[PDB]
């Protein structure tokens, strides 16, 4: 397209939703191409990601972490306005994974405080992609402070199988995947800091370990549970968007399946399907396709157990309807 | 299906055996759909995991780790008799990654010591798939106490490759491995416990830096070696399956390959083929059937190196046969420069 | 092949070339198979890993970390003659990931410094796959002191999409990553030893951490930066192989994509397409095609950030041409 054909094109404003819901979107492309327009403020702020009170200098893309997901369709434009407020402290950037050139748009986009920019790209590649921030030299220290997040780039007819049949999603879910390096003290006590600099040094240590002390859902542990737990209805179909910036994840529902998973998060690779535990490399995003044919309490999970269930890799989804004994019953209940 | 029609389907009852071993059972399914009958007592034991005499307080179904393998066929219905002990401690339960609801039965499961249970579930996906122990609040403290086995549902028409054609094993293994996380004292030794209970939070803290002591296959060091290596021929089909309940593993037969890998373990997702080392999720199971063509001794390892020759994650296949030297040959066996 | 057949072949010596280049060949086959013969010496020498000084006595197929990449194509026959000088101190041989037979090559290749080996085996199977020395008892010593590369067994007919048509790379790069677990003292320096057998026990102290020091692309921190970034133009076709021998990584051109991508490193499994960061687990290959769409300065990375920029593992592409601002554009750069 010239600069003419683009300067012609329909503009859409999309107005952004916290984690793990998505904004309004149609799954089918409506109309040619369009410049999908976003505004994010980077919000460098204090989060609590545990019960013991344990703080992150987290640097949030719309004040989240993750940052919200942001849909467009196939070879329409993102036209992202990122905005630094004077209240931050250091100099950040956007890289879209979903984007080809000046390393996915970070060259393009490094703001200090009380700056903003906007980048446009063409949405050439269907699938789910990460975007993060990067800025040179500090890279990891921004991704693991929780500065990350996705996008989807929906096939314009929508999502099929790998054979052309067209899977249409009722609810779709976003579950942005972070690791966390938090320093502690010589009683193994979690550490506070009071600006994310005096963190720094001490952060970079942990993250050379490797060793996560924490890896959560949407910022912290138990976040999608209880008032937060994804919701669902036997017969519904349900689209899980799971992105990790940073370090490798291994998404599991438990009590279901995925039932068509693009693992790569790339919609022209053909899904997998009846996945038990699917597979996300660290900087990638996946999603997973799944119609519950059962009610109750769902757990979905980092299925590396002990990143779940104490490192805080666990979320809830709770669905209503009827129990369908053909699948599964209890023939003989626990008894003596 | 109906209750009725449920009730009225023919039952089989199926005597497992140890792994790598796996049941008899016929890869394309003879008749129709079957209520396949298993039954597992859970052991909590002592086990020793290396020649140094570490030992585990190891939770295990049917009293190895890992648990056996179950063997049906896809829309069969695995109809499970779950035993614990009153020589046990601990609540156990059950969850199958190939079950639908009751986050994979483990809700409907939960069995105190002196007490059984029957879970019953439509195999509805074929491949091979994990199961383990999911107390809740205590939940890889289980599996990584060895807690956790595979079942496979074949398809009715058994195994094909990605296009159509039929792909039938001569022999099956089944290779579990596991993650173990042992205390070790100011030494650096490993430490022994009296009961499961005293061992917990000396395990949770080496659980928490996710670097396992051992990673093992058939709950030990060494044990699928010298007497019980694994065994195939020249031209023998051997299918491995392969689980890891807790933890990435990538598999390899060093010497040869995996000519069809189900890496997700899934037969609806067509094989990978020509694989040199497969990669199979924690949390998963995963298949590969290789052909050999040549004899000898070979490693059958998880490539991370480390974790096989220090680790423990590697087991050995005899072959017997001729050499073939089109496929290889010493050109000049090593001699003086 | 009968045996009067196999002795028929033509014989041709091929030189090899040191990484990430790799030696000329064509991508189609010429003439019917062939006996391709190769030889390497190997160096146990010291080298420098990071900006420390921080020495690692390397185990180098040819003198470099990675081995050269070897290539042929599929149903020709590889006859590697591998030397090992008597000034070396340790056996070592070599296993082929693409062979059959013997532990793919190393049960019959046990050489003793002063000692030399001829190896032949038939590639049956295209794709990318990894080599590494394994002395029985010492293979990941071996292993993670970099005696490990890659080679490449193409298709007879070249490249093809998982639709049959062509691709074709106008070049062709081998990364090699390394993981290196090297000792430190108390004080946290890195040590030095003597000779390579002096460093063994504290090494395997390192190795049972599964903690690498360093992750590193071409044997250091920095070797395909700057000065020694890979190059491409805008509209090249380019192949990127990577091993990693011990090792998961996950690869990820950023600014890029991997536009088909053999993440199990062979031909015959379809390529996923589009990918964002593609995932070769430890002791595999892998292959990514790429068509360079944007000029400027690409990182191609590991994509635990950690592992890419606190540990090493991080290259650089320096693409010219000229800058596609429908794919992208700075519709306000960064301004107060
Ligand atoms: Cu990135
Ligand atoms: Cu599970
Ligand atoms: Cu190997
Ligand atoms: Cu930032
Ligand atoms: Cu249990
Ligand atoms: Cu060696």
């Given at each position: 397209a010239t600069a003419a054909e683009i300067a012609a094109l329909p503009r859409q404003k999309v107005e952004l939703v916290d984690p793990p819901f998505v904004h309004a979107h149609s799954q089918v492309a409506e109309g040619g191409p369009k410049v999908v327009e976003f505004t994010m403020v980077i919000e460098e702020k204090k989060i609590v990601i545990d019960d013991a009170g344990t703080e992150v200098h987290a640097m949030a893309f719309?004040?989240?972490?993750?940052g919200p997901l942001m849909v467009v369709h196939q070879d329409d434009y993102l036209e992202l306005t990122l905005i630094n407020p004077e209240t931050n402290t250091l100099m950040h950037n956007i890289d879209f994974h979903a984007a080809t050139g000046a390393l996915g748009g970070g060259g393009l986009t490094e703001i200090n405080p009380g700056e903003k920019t906007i980048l446009r790209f063409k949405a050439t590649k269907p699938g789910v992609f990460v975007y993060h921030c990067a800025p040179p030299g500090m890279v990891p220290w921004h991704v693991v402070s929780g500065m990350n997040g996705a996008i989807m780039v929906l096939p314009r007819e929508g999502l099929h199988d790998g054979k052309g049949k067209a899977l249409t999603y009722d609810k779709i879910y976003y579950v942005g995947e972070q690791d966390f390096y938090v320093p502690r003290d010589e009683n193994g006590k979690y550490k506070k800091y009071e600006a994310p600099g005096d963190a720094y040094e001490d952060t970079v240590k942990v993250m050379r370990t490797l060793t996560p002390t924490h890896v959560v859902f949407?910022?912290?542990?138990?976040?999608?549970?209880?008032?937060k737990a994804m919701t669902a209805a036997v017969g519904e179909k349900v689209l899980i968007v799971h992105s990790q910036a940073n370090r490798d994840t291994r998404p599991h529902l438990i009590g279901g399946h995925?039932?068509?998973?693009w693992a790569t998060g790339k919609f022209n690779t053909p899904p997998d399907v009846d996945q038990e535990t699917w597979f996300i490399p660290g900087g990638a995003a996946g999603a997973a396709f799944y119609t519950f044919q059962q009610p109750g309490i769902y757990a979905y999970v980092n299925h590396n157990l002990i990143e779940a269930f104490e490192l805080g890799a666990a979320a809830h989804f709770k669905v209503t309807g009827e129990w369908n004994d053909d699948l599964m019953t209890s023939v003989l209940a626990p008894s003596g």
């Open positions: 719309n004040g989240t972490v993750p949407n910022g912290a542990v138990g976040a999608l549970t209880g008032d995925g039932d068509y998973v």
